[PDB]
């Protein structure tokens, strides 16, 4: 009976550093490293899962964790990593959006093309876990990325957003249209070059995605991969997220200036108050130029406006 355990980042680092001569070439999908230890083979995965196989498996496992669970699991590929393992090193276009949940502002979709020779460079900019990066880091990293790799962006401003919405087009359909159009722009811009893969950070079922594009004049379908948390699959997606956020911030600064009031992000109470201030100082119609009207925030702001 081989043994498996769950190791945190500290444990993973200790394991890798401990065993001198750790192997990292030609390993199963998801595996970080393997140890050709005598009487026991150790394989550590991205998920933190570490497997001990061999005669002295239980013994080796005990050296790191107490009460190591035994299982029949083998050092095989991890389904969660099958995609990253194959797409990670390819030249690819990655796309993602921002602003969907923000009462104020547009929806921004960006796509970045990272050719094989630029993968390391973009990754060195610390694009991984872009979710952890604050706005100031975005303003710092985005420009570097835009300067290194080709990209495209499609900004859905509030007046157009509101028009599509009141017409019956839900956000899901809006996003599908924006991704497709942004992808079309990047594909033509990098031609004659062609990406080995096109990865869309999943926001809805593939089947539903293309159905929404049935009326589009041009549809990017070819080597399109719809994957969840795509940022962990390819640096191009992470790059897209950062660019999208950078543009969103830039749009918000411009929008706040046009409105004459600082527009907070999100859709909390502070947004309700801000919307109330806008109505009183500029008129309710001003919201049509800077907010996603159908949001519940509109009703709340109008109430606060008359309440004062
Ligand atoms: Mg997304």
In the chain, domain spans: 1-89, 90-308
Residues contacting 56, CB < 8 A, separation 6+? 39, 40
Residues contacting 70, CB < 8 A, separation 6+? 1, 2, 3, 4, 58
Query: What is the distance in A from the centroid of ligand 1 to the CA of 194?
Result: 23
Query: What is the distance in A from the centroid of ligand 1 to the CA of 277?
Result: 31
> Exposure of 121 by Cβ count < 10 A (0-12 exposed, 13-18 middle, 19+ buried)?
middle
CA angle 151, 46, 116 (to 5 degrees): 30
| CATH number of the domain located at residue range(s) 1-89 in this protein | 3.30.310.10
Query: What is the distance in A from the centroid of ligand 1 to the CA of 97?
Result: 5
Which is nearest to 12 in space by CA: 33, 30, 26? 33
Query: What is the distance in A from the centroid of ligand 1 to the CA of 198?
Result: 14
> Rounded to the nearest 5°, which phi and psi values hold at 154?
-130, 120
Residues contacting 285, CB < 8 A, separation 6+? none
Q: Which residue has the tokens 């926001």?
A: 203
Which method was it determined by? X-ray
Tokens of 19: 């065993």
Tokens of 197: 């893969």
CA 118 to chain centre: 19
DSSP 95-128: EEEE-TT-SBS-EEEEEEEE-GGGHHHHHHT--T
Residues contacting 51, CB < 8 A, separation 6+? 2, 3, 4, 42, 43, 44, 45, 73, 74, 75
Residues with CB under 5 A from ligand 1 (ion): 96, 201, 203
3 state SS of 67: coil
Cβ count within 10 A of residue 53: 18
Query: What is the distance in A from the centroid of ligand 1 to the CA of 214?
Result: 21
Q: Which class does domain 90-308 fall in?
A: alpha beta
Residues contacting 269, CB < 8 A, separation 6+? none
d(CA 58, CA 39): 11
Query: What is the distance in A from the centroid of ligand 1 to the CA of 282?
Result: 34
d(CA 228, CA 226): 7
C-alpha dihedral (220, 226, 231, 235), degrees to nearest 10: -40
Query: What is the distance in A from the centroid of ligand 1 to the CA of 98?
Result: 7
CA angle 145, 146, 149 (to 5 degrees): 75
Residue 272 labeled ligand binder = no
156 in Cβ contact with 87 (< 8 Å): no
Residue 201 labeled ligand binder = yes
**Resolution for this experimental structure (Å):** 2.1
CA angle 144, 146, 148 (to 5 degrees): 70
Residue 273 labeled ligand binder = no
Query: What is the distance in A from the centroid of ligand 1 to the CA of 229?
Result: 7
d(CA 128, CA 288): 36
Q: Which residue has the tokens 């061999």?
A: 54
């Amino acid at each position: 009976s081989n043994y498996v355990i769950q190791a945190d980042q500290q444990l993973l680092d200790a394991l890798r550093a401990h065993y001198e001569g750790a192997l990292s070439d030609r390993l199963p999908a998801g595996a970080l490293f393997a140890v050709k230890r005598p009487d026991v083979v150790i394989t550590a995965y991205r998920s933190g899962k570490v497997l001990f196989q061999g005669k002295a498996a239980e013994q080796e496992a005990a050296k790191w964790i107490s009460g190591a669970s035994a299982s029949n699991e083998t050092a095989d590929h991890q389904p969660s990593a099958l995609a990253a393992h194959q797409l990670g090193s390819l030249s690819a276009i990655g796309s993602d959006e921002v602003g969907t949940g923000d009462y104020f502002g547009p929806i921004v979709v960006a796509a970045a093309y990272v050719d094989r020779p630029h993968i390391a460079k973009i990754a060195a900019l610390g694009v991984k876990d872009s979710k952890q990066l604050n706005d100031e880091a975005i303003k710092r990293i985005a420009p570097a990325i835009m300067e290194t790799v080709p990209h495209a962006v499609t900004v859905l401003d509030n007046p157009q957003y509101n028009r599509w919405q009141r017409s019956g087009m839900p956000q899901t359909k809006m996003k599908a249209l924006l991704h497709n159009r942004t992808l079309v722009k990047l594909v033509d811009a990098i031609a004659p070059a062609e990406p080995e893969a096109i990865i869309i950070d999943e926001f809805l079922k593939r089947d539903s995605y293309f159905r929404y594009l049935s009326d589009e004049d041009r549809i990017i379908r070819e080597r399109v991969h719809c994957l969840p948390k795509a940022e962990s699959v390819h640096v191009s997606v992470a790059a897209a997220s950062i660019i999208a956020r950078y543009v969103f911030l830039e749009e918000m600064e411009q929008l706040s200036r046009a409105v004459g009031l600082l527009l907070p992000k999100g859709a909390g109470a502070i947004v309700d108050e801000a919307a109330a201030r806008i109505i009183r100082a500029r008129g309710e119609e001003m919201l049509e130029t800077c907010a996603k009207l159908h949001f519940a925030n509109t009703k709340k702001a109008l109430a606060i406006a008359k309440r004062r």
